[PDB]
């Protein structure tokens, strides 16, 4: 297992524009296109991202390409964030994948606001972090996914994904 397989599991793969759990237009492996209610706006953002007139549909390779970019941007975002980087650097490789997943889902900003959980993770207080992390709108909205990521962070193993 790795970050790519993990997120491919959590996000799935859809070749046609769809709405995510919050109702926003998305395509491929969780690539958010826009927070706007306009499908045309979403189609405009897609064609811009792909480089052609897609008509709301892309191929598997195109989806994988957006995913690679998105994964890359997520890590880089973490390394550029002063609140996030130090946590990330303190972690082992498995736990790091849990941090990347959260950021991919919620944005760096979002994640950087889990102040308390961030500190517990940095101090290696696993169980405590796990409980603090669950006290969030994130967990109440997407509990099954939130449980898998929380367990990854708590245990440093891929068990939730086997």
The set of catalytic residues is 11, 20
Binding of Cl ion at residue 40 (CB under 5 A)? no
Q: Which of 98, 102, 69 is nearest to 161 (CA)?
A: 98
Binding of Cl ion at residue 44 (CB under 5 A)? no
Backbone phi, then psi, for 32, in 5-degree steps?
Answer: -65, 130
Residue identified by tokens 């859809």 is 14
Binding of Cl ion at residue 49 (CB under 5 A)? yes
DSSP conformational letter for 2: -
**What is the closest distance, in whole angstroms, from the C-beta atom of residue 50 to Cl ion in the complex?**
8
**What is the closest distance, in whole angstroms, from the C-beta atom of residue 41 to Cl ion in the complex?**
15
Is 117 annotated in some ligand binding site? yes
**Binds Cl ion by CB under 5 A, chosen from 34, 122, 136, 142:** 142
DSSP conformational letter for 151: H
d(C-alpha 55, C-alpha 86), whole Å: 42
Residues 90-119 that bind Cl ion (CB under 5 A): none
Q: Which residues are annotated as a binding site for substrate?
A: 32, 104, 117, 132
């Amino acid at each position: 297992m790795n970050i790519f397989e993990m997120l491919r599991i959590d996000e799935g793969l859809r070749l046609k524009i769809y709405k995510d759990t919050e109702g926003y237009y998305t395509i491929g492996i969780g690539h958010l296109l826009t927070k706007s209610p306009s499908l045309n706006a979403a189609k405009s953002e897609l064609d811009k991202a792909i480089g052609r007139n897609t008509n709301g549909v892309i191929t598997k390779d195109e989806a994988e390409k957006l995913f690679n970019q998105d994964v890359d941007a997520a890590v880089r975002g973490i390394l550029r964030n002063a609140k996030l980087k130090p946590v990330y650097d303190s972690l082992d490789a498995v736990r790091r994948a849990a941090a990347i997943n959260m950021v991919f889902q919620m944005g760096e900003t979002g994640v950087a606001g889990f102040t308390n959980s961030l500190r517990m993770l940095q101090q290696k207080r696993w169980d405590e972090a796990a409980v603090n992390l669950a006290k969030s709108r994130w967990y109440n909205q997407t509990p099954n996914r939130a449980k898998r990521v929380i367990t990854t962070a708590r245990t440093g193993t891929w068990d939730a994904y086997k």
